[PDB]
């Protein structure tokens, strides 16, 4: 097989454009901005998990102060209902009121302990809300930089796509087809002959085949014996 040397040089640039598009696709899946957004999202979920755990403890303490204040109201109402006054049975109410006054005091002790504990946890929850709010703000900053990097990679991809479309139209389709058949093997399809090493698979070509490669004409097309990529000189 043979092909004009002018289009063989176009095939070399064509293999260069394909390599650049490969790095663009690789960069789109390995962005540094995406890694930054992954970190901020992780620790934002950390505070969201701690905020949810604090909400459970606050619900439990809210249920305690609701049960405490309700039982004191029953003792307070019983003290006020019995406050409205038989003198023989009056002493019977005096001994009960003293025992109920001891119950209202003992209940107020437990109520102040859980009110302090609720006041401490509401401050901790307030400290985590400030923390997750600051994390969320720069999370959107990382999200705008992640999206801004994707539109730059896509813009550079479209420009290399237009350059690739122009090169294929300038080469005989019989040569472009062989380049695609070699890429279907996983190789680079076309690479330069750098000294004695292939520019694609990076092998060291033996002295035997290389003696025949240097003897081929300019219009001739040659491939690497190990990978098959079209060697260009
Ligand atoms: Zn090769």
Author numbering: 1 to 85, 92 to 239
Please quote the authors directly.
The MSMEG_4306 gene in Mycobacterium smegmatis encodes a protein of unknown function, and its homologue Rv2229c in M. tuberculosis has been shown to be essential for survival. Amino-acid sequence analysis of MSMEG_4306 does not indicate statistically significant similarity to any protein of known function.
Since the two homologues are likely to be too distantly related for successful molecular replacement, we decided to solve the structure of MSMEG_4306 by experimental phasing. The structure of MSMEG_4306 was solved by zinc SAD phasing using the CRANK2 pipeline as implemented in CCP4. The partial model thus obtained was further refined using REFMAC5 and phenix.refine, and the model was built manually using Coot.
